Design a protein around this ligand. Sequence first.
Ligand SMILES: [Cu+2]
Lengths: 341, 341
Amino acid sequence: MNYKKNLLLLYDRPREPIFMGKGKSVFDVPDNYLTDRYRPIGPEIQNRFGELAEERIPVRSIALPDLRIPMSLGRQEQFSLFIPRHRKIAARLIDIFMGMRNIEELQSCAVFARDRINPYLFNYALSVALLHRRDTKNLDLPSVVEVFPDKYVDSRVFEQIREEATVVPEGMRMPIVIPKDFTASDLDEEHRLWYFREDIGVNLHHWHWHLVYPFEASNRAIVDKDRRGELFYYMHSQLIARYNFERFCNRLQRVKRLNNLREPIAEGYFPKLDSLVASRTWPGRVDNAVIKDLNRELDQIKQDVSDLERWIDRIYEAVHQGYVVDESGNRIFLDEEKGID
Amino acid sequence: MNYKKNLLLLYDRPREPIFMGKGKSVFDVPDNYLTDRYRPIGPEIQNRFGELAEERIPVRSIALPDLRIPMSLGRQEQFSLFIPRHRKIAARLIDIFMGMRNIEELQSCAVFARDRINPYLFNYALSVALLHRRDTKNLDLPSVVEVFPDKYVDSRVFEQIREEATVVPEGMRMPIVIPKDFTASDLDEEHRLWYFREDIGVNLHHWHWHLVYPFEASNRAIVDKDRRGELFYYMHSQLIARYNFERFCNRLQRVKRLNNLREPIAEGYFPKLDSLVASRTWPGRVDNAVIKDLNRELDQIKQDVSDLERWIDRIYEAVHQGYVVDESGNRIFLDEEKGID
Ligand SMILES: [Cu+2]
């Protein structure tokens, strides 16, 4: 039905309010669906952006589960699935979208939530829901490059794209060249591997792999895929095999592992990305930075380097021992078949 | 006369005693010319080596100044012109050879001294005397590679040359290949410049340049060659220009200067040379070695790093000021003409 195609419009222009009209359509949102900022002038808006629209999508006003947790993350904040706290927020939102029985209520829940929660988070939570509901199958999700170009492109282009789009009429617009080999000069031998590290393609593959094989949510909510452990081993293992190949093609040696976490990290990296959602840039790492104990009260991270070292020491022990121990105290054997997994 | 050609025989086999016979000749040395080790069995020797020679060169017994200072340096010790003490020893010996009126007494002094003083030192002292004594002009001094191959060749070959020369008859002897690119592997990017750093040619040029333009000997005219200061600047300046060129041809950046002496030296170098005169090998320098205050009582070196730093600070000051100050206290101006010199 249409509903499937109407959800895809949510991916359009993530930071433009949902009432501004996406593609050749526009949403006819209730006033209790308007944000607190814009609700007090709702009448002036629905009318103002009604123009230029072929279709008008109605949206029924429903109950809507509590969106406190989803909304806890700031709108101008970054979103990562590695941070403990974000995991709990996303997994909760995924749970809401996943828990809407009908494809019509999913559209209603989405339309409301969209302008209240972090765009990056919304995109993830929706992507995961759509991909793993039964009614929304075979649905072609727009490339995350197209919805979030800031994670894939030198920040320099953005003010050129703004200039070009404002000054020059459509049809006469020149294609914007995206800078390559732009993060470091030839003094850094690492700069040679730009075509791999910074390639759009491989970064998309990595992002998507983690979409379809998450490590947290609910085992029935898509965590427990056959041999996902072995997959995690192999896929990442092939990344380095391919990387090491490309290294040899640029007169470099094989990548040296992170022997130990106390010694400095020789290779710094300034990525040159600017998050338009956070309105800030990603920080760089300097040469010879040292790993430091984390105390990020907000993010819910209280971890010492020694904690990491302790985990490693134990994992090594298990691997040599040949077995692990479950919470219960029983032993599980790292056999030829399932060991790696 | 013959005398000129007879001195060249001293350069032959530097560590073989002078009574063993050089080329197609042999020396008829007095018994008071024999060393303390060999004098007590002089009769057995002069006879044992005398034959199979077309010539026997007589040598008249002369007075001979005290050779204490020349003999102060051990026979199995290394010799460098940079070490303060060696400078005083060599300059004194040079003075003796230089001070022998006749080309016959030079031959007599030499023949005596040769087996009592350090071979490396002898070679230098003689080389300098011949080139600047007035009788021995326009001469052909043998290449120092041929007399001291240990300073120009991987030590590995020496036991092959000994094997080949003992086992195989003359005429059937295979040429010994000299290893190239042998001091470091491809993990060290510096190894690429072997063909320049370790080339026989350029090392000979450097050695010889310092022969004809010494910086301190005795008698100022020998040091005082036209614009030798500017020469010292330019010649060495061209070495680095050429080096920096060769760097660019091996995918390397321009050579980084020694900014400051307290910071570690990143690039180590093990030269793989074995001094047959010292019977030891040259020490290597490890990666990230640090310069340290010297206290070499024997060599007469008592220098702190800060001394070096102080000299540099003062030289910079003079250069910026635009003038220097002589011992007397007067000022000399670094003009366009003689400034560099
Ligand atoms: Cu020099």
